[PDB]
Amino acid sequence: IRENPVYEKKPKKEVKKKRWNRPKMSLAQKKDRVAQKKASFLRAQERA
Sign of the dihedral through C-alpha 41, 42, 43, 48:
positive
**Does the footprint of RNA cover residue 28 (CB under 7 A)?**
yes
Q: What is the closest distance, in whole angstroms, from the C-beta atom of residue 15 to RNA in the complex?
A: 16
**Does the footprint of RNA cover residue 45 (CB under 7 A)?**
no
Which of 43, 45, 46, 48 forms a contact with RNA (CB under 7 A)? 43
Interface with RNA by CB under 7 A: which residues? Answer: 25-26, 28-29, 31-33, 36-37, 39-40, 43
